Design a protein around this nucleic acid. Structure first.
Ligand code: K
Ligand code: K
Ligand code: K
Ligand code: MG
Ligand code: MG
Ligand code: MG
Ligand code: MG
Ligand code: MG
Ligand code: MG
Ligand code: MG
Ligand code: MG
Ligand code: MG
Ligand code: MG
Ligand code: MG
Ligand code: MG
Ligand code: MG
Ligand code: MG
Ligand code: MG
Ligand code: MG
Ligand code: MG
Ligand code: MG
Ligand code: MG
Ligand code: MG
Ligand code: MG
Ligand code: MG
Ligand code: MG
Ligand code: MG
Ligand code: MG
Ligand code: MG
Ligand code: MG
Ligand code: MG
Ligand code: MG
Ligand code: MG
Ligand code: MG
Ligand code: MG
Ligand code: MG
Ligand code: MG
Ligand code: MG
Lengths: 23, 116, 96, 208, 86, 137
RNA sequence: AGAGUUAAAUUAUAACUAAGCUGUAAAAAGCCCUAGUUAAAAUAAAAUAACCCACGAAAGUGACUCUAAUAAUCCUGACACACGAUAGCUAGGACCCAAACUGGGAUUAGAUACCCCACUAUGCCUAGCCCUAAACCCAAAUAGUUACAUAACAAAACUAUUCGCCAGAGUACUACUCGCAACUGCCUAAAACUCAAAGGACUUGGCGGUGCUUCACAUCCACCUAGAGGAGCCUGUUCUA
C-alpha cells in the first residue's frame, strides 16, 4: 500500500527535525 | 420508512458533499447473519447472599439454615434445568421469525441482481 | 427488460402490454420454422425450467414423439455431449 | 467399550417386576423395553439383587480398594461395620433409662447419616481472568458433593492415623465423630465454607 | 435544578412489585436513547469520531430496515410447495 | 382498576394516601450508583437525613464494593436503620448509571422497607463540562 | 459580523448527616479542607430535534432574540488583490473543566509508554501575527451525450472550449537562491553519488495475542486414579578420561 511511502517521508522529516534542534 | 439515499454517497454527479462513507457497498446479500449467542450471567446470587447471612450468624453450621440451604439447592437445580434446555429449543422456536437456515433458502429463491 | 421495448405496445398503469401484432408475425414464422425442421426428420427438444408446467410440457413432448428436458440442466450437457450422454451422440437440431 | 450404543443398563430391582399391575405409565415403559427388542448388557459382578446390599456401600468399598484387591477392600468394609456395631452396643449397655433409647445400633443408618453431614454445600473452582486466578464459589452438583464427602473420609483416615492403629478401627472412630458433627472431616467441611463466604463478592466472575 | 421534582423520568409501582416498574423505566430511557447517551458521555469523543459514528449508525439503519422489508415481502412465499417432485 | 404511571401532581388533589400521609410527605431514598461505589441515603420530606449507608461502610473494600452484592447488602443495612426510625414507605431516586442500581432497589425491598415510586435523576449535561479523554486499554 | 439573553450539568460557598472518599483486569498513590442531600453566581460548552442534508467561495456553521446581510442579465483566467481549521507567537483579561510538559503510583528485564492521581502551557474573550493539514469527495472550471465501449480496483463510459500540473526510484516536504511582522520558520527547489529497479491493482497459499458459530469423551479448562523429578541400584546419553 501507499503507506510504504508516507513512512519513508515520516522518518526523513523526523530526522531532519532533530538535525535542526541539535545544531 | 427507510432513510433517503438521495444525494448522500460521494458521486461525480453530486453537488452536495458526502454525508455517508460506508465501509462496504450497500448491496443486499443473499444470506442473513447467524443469530448471536446470549452471553451468560452468574445465577443464584440473590439466594446465595441470604444463605451466607445465616452461616455467618450461626458459626457456619446448617443446624438453623435448612430453609436457606434447600432454596440454594433448588436454585441450582432450577438454573441447571434452564441452562441444559435453552440451546435445543431456541433453534426451532424461532420467536415467530424463521431460523437463519430457512431465510437463506428463501433469499436464494429470490436473489438480488447487481449485474445486468 | 431493455431489449423488449420495441415489442411492447405500451404500458397500462405500470403493467406492460405486449403488441400481439408483432407476436402474430413472429409466431407465424416460428411455427413455420418448427414444422420444416420436423419434416426433415429433425430432433426437437422442449426446454422449460418452470415448476408449474413441467408435467404438462413433459406430456406434450411424448404425444408429439419429441424430446423434453424440464428437469435440472447439467453444466456440460450440450457442450461436452460425448462425456455426458455417450460416445457418439446426435445433437438436437432445434430447441424450444 | 465392547457394548454398542444399543445396549442399555439392566434393571436389577426385583420389586419393580413383581408389582407392575398397580400402575399404568410404568407398565408402558417396560413392555416397550423388549417390544423394541433392545439389547441388555450383562449383569455387573458387583451389583446383585440381594436385599442386604446398599449402593452407597459399594461406591465406598470401591474407593477403599488399592490395586485390585476387592477381597481386601470388602474385608475392611466388613470389619468397619462390625467395629461400629461393637462400640454402639457397648455404649447402649452402660446408659441410663433415657439414654438407652437414644443410641443407634444400626451401622447402615450411621454410615448413611455420617456422609450426609460431611458433604459441602458450596464448592470453589479457579477462574482465570486478567492474568490471575480467583477462587469463585459454585453450586456443586449432588453427585460431586456425595463423591467429595467419601474422598475426605478416605483421605483423613489414611494420612494422619498412627502406624499401630488398624484401618478398620480408625475409620470406625471417624464415623462416630462425623455422626455427632464434631469430626475433623466436619471441620474441613466448615473450612471450605469459610473460604467460600470470604470470596462471596467474586461470584460475579462465573458465567453459568 | 429549577424545575419541579418527581415529575420527569418517574414511574409508580403497582400491586407492590418493584422489578416490573424498574423495567418499565429502562424501556422509557432506552427508547429515548438516554442509556446510550450516558454511556458515550463517560469519556469524550472527538468530533472526528462523532461523525464517523453517525455514518456507521445511519448506514446500518438503512441496510437493516431494507433487508427487513424484503423478509416481510417474501414472507408469504414460505408455504409448502404445491409442485413437489413435478 | 385504572392505574396511572405518572405521579400525582401536587397542584391537584389525588386521594392516594400511603400510611395516612400524602405523596409529597413520604421520605426520599437517594441512590448514587457509580461505577465503583454505591451510596444510599434516606431523607425526610423536609430533606432532613435519617440514615446513611454505602458499600464502603458495610465492610466491602476496594474492587469488591463495586459489585452488585455489595450494593444489595447496603440496601438491606440502610433499610434496617431507616425502619428503626419508623418509616414504612419511601420514594427512591436513582442517581447515575452503575452496576448497583438493581441490587440497591431490591435491597431496600428485602430490608423491611417498601418503595412506591422510582425516579432516575442521572446527570445529563445539555452540551456542559468537557469530560475526560478516552482510555486506550 | 455585531448587540442582548440562558435552559441541563459543574464549581466557589453555607447548612445537615455519615467515616471514609476517589480509582482499576487487580492495586497503590492521592484526599480525609472529604462524601451524600438541600440552597447557588461566574467561566466554559451547546442532550433529544438530526432516520433531516440546508447556508457559504473554501476552511467552516446546527441554544434563543434583534440589527446589518449573502457579488455578476446569469463563460475560462495567474506569480496580482482578499481569505484560510488546528497547533504556535506578542500584549491584556477570563479559568468551571479538559489537558502536552512535569511529579507520584502501578506494570515491566528496563517503561523517561499504554493504565491510575495531581497540576501548568493552552483550549476561551479583545487587538496583531503566523498562512501550515490525509486543506482528500485523493475525482479542476464551464456546456453537454448514454452514443462508442468493460486493463484491474474504486465512485460507469465520454465529447467540446480553457487553465494548472506531470519526463524512472532513492538522495529530497533536503543543500544553495528570491520574497515574507516568518529567525528551530514558510514558499520556490537542484546536483554529485547509488541501484535495475521503485510503484498501482489482483490471484492462490500460509499466518493472525482478528470477530461470529460449532467442537475436544484421555481431553485444552473444570475434574478422576496411579506415577516421574527426592534415595539406593540397573541401564542409555552428554561431559570428564
Ligand atoms: K444546548
Ligand atoms: K486465502
Ligand atoms: K527415574
Ligand atoms: Mg530517508
Ligand atoms: Mg454548495
Ligand atoms: Mg475503504
Ligand atoms: Mg443553571
Ligand atoms: Mg465577534
Ligand atoms: Mg493508601
Ligand atoms: Mg462537597
Ligand atoms: Mg471564581
Ligand atoms: Mg451534515
Ligand atoms: Mg461561486
Ligand atoms: Mg450568490
Ligand atoms: Mg473570472
Ligand atoms: Mg490560521
Ligand atoms: Mg488557534
Ligand atoms: Mg491559540
Ligand atoms: Mg519568537
Ligand atoms: Mg498570552
Ligand atoms: Mg489554566
Ligand atoms: Mg483538572
Ligand atoms: Mg513516572
Ligand atoms: Mg476538510
Ligand atoms: Mg490535492
Ligand atoms: Mg479540489
Ligand atoms: Mg480553475
Ligand atoms: Mg462561477
Ligand atoms: Mg458539469
Ligand atoms: Mg477478472
Ligand atoms: Mg511517459
Ligand atoms: Mg531523478
Ligand atoms: Mg512541510
Ligand atoms: Mg525547507
Ligand atoms: Mg493427558
Ligand atoms: Mg512404583
Ligand atoms: Mg530418581
Ligand atoms: Mg544414571
Amino acid at each position: 500500500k501507499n503507506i510504504l511511502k508516507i513512512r519513508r517521508r515520516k522518518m526523513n522529516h523526523h530526522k531532519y527535525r532533530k538535525l535542526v534542534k541539535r545544531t | 420508512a427507510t432513510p433517503s439515499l438521495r444525494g448522500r454517497l460521494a458521486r461525480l454527479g453530486n453537488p452536495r458533499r458526502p454525508i455517508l462513507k460506508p465501509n462496504k457497498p450497500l448491496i443486499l446479500a443473499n444470506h442473513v447473519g447467524e443469530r448471536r449467542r446470549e452471553k451468560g450471567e452468574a445465577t443464584c446470587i440473590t439466594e446465595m447472599s441470604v444463605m451466607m447471612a445465616c452461616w455467618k450468624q450461626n458459626e457456619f453450621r446448617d443446624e438453623a439454615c435448612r430453609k436457606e440451604i434447600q432454596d440454594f439447592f433448588d436454585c441450582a437445580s432450577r438454573a441447571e434445568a434452564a441452562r441444559k434446555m435453552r440451546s435445543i429449543q431456541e433453534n426451532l422456536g424461532e420467536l415467530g421469525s424463521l431460523p437463519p437456515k430457512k431465510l437463506n433458502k428463501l433469499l436464494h429463491r429470490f436473489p438480488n441482481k447487481p449485474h445486468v | 427488460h431493455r431489449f423488449m421495448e420495441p415489442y411492447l405496445f405500451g404500458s397500462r398503469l405500470g403493467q406492460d402490454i405486449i403488441d400481439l401484432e408483432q407476436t402474430a408475425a413472429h409466431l407465424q414464422l416460428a411455427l413455420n420454422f418448427t414444422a420444416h425442421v420436423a419434416y426433415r426428420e429433425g430432433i426437437i427438444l422442449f426446454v422449460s425450467r418452470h415448476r408449474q408446467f413441467a408435467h404438462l410440457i413433459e406430456t406434450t413432448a411424448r404425444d408429439c414423439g419429441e424430446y423434453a428436458h424440464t428437469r435440472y440442466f447439467k453444466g456440460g450437457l450440450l457442450t461436452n455431449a460425448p462425456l455426458l450422454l455417450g460416445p457418439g451422440v446426435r445433437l438436437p437440431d432445434l430447441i424450444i | 467399550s465392547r457394548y454398542g450404543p444399543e445396549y442399555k443398563d439392566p434393571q436389577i430391582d426385583k420389586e419393580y417386576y413383581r408389582k407392575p399391575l398397580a400402575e399404568q405409565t410404568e407398565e408402558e415403559k417396560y413392555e416397550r423395553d423388549f417390544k423394541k427388542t433392545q439389547l441388555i448388557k450383562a449383569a455387573p459382578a458387583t451389583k446383585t439383587s440381594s436385599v442386604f446390599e446398599d449402593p452407597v456401600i459399594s461406591k465406598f468399598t470401591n474407593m477403599m480398594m488399592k490395586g485390585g484387591n476387592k477381597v481386601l477392600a470388602r474385608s475392611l468394609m466388613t470389619q468397619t461395620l462390625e467395629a461400629v456395631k461393637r462400640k454402639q452396643f457397648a455404649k447402649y449397655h452402660a446408659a441410663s433409662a433415657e439414654e438407652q433409647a437414644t443410641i443407634e445400633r444400626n451401622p447402615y443408618t450411621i454410615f448413611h447419616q455420617a456422609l450426609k453431614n460431611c458433604e459441602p454445600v458450596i464448592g470453589l473452582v479457579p477462574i482465570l481472568k486478567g492474568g490471575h486466578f480467583y477462587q469463585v464459589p459454585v453450586p456443586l452438583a449432588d453427585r460431586r458433593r456425595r463423591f467429595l464427602a467419601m474422598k475426605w473420609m478416605i483421605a483423613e483416615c489414611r494420612e494422619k492415623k498412627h502406624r499401630r492403629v488398624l484401618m478398620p478401627e480408625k475409620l470406625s472412630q471417624e464415623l462416630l465423630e462425623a455422626f455427632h458433627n464434631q469430626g475433623p472431616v466436619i471441620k474441613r467441611k466448615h473450612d471450605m465454607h469459610k473460604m467460600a463466604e470470604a470470596n462471596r463478592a467474586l461470584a460475579h466472575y462465573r458465567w453459568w | 435544578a429549577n424545575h419541579l421534582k418527581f415529575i420527569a423520568r418517574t414511574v409508580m409501582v403497582q400491586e407492590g412489585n418493584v422489578e416490573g416498574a424498574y423495567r418499565t423505566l429502562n424501556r422509557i430511557l432506552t427508547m429515548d436513547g438516554l442509556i446510550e447517551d450516558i454511556k458515550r458521555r463517560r469519556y469524550y469523543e472527538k468530533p472526528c469520531r462523532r461523525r464517523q459514528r453517525e455514518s456507521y449508525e445511519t448506514c446500518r439503519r438503512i441496510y437493516n430496515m431494507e433487508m427487513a422489508r424484503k423478509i416481510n415481502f417474501l414472507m408469504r412465499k414460505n408455504r409448502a410447495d404445491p409442485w413437489q417432485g413435478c | 382498576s385504572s392505574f396511572s404511571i405518572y405521579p400525582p401532581i401536587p397542584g391537584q388533589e389525588n386521594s392516594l394516601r400511603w400510611a395516612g400521609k400524602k405523596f409529597e410527605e413520604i421520605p426520599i431514598a437517594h441512590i448514587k450508583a457509580s461505577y465503583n461505589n454505591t451510596q444510599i441515603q434516606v431523607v425526610s420530606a423536609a430533606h432532613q437525613p435519617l440514615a446513611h449507608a454505602s458499600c464502603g461502610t458495610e465492610g466491602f473494600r476496594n474492587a469488591k464494593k463495586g459489585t452488585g452484592i455489595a450494593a444489595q447488602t447496603a440496601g438491606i443495612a440502610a433499610a434496617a436503620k431507616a425502619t428503626g426510625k419508623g418509616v414504612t414507605h419511601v420514594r427512591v431516586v436513582v442517581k447515575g448509571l452503575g452496576p448497583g442500581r438493581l441490587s440497591a432497589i431490591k435491597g431496600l425491598t428485602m430490608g423491611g422497607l417498601e418503595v412506591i415510586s422510582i425516579t432516575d435523576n442521572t446527570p445529563i449535561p445539555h452540551x456542559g463540562c468537557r469530560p475526560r479523554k478516552a482510555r486506550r486499554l
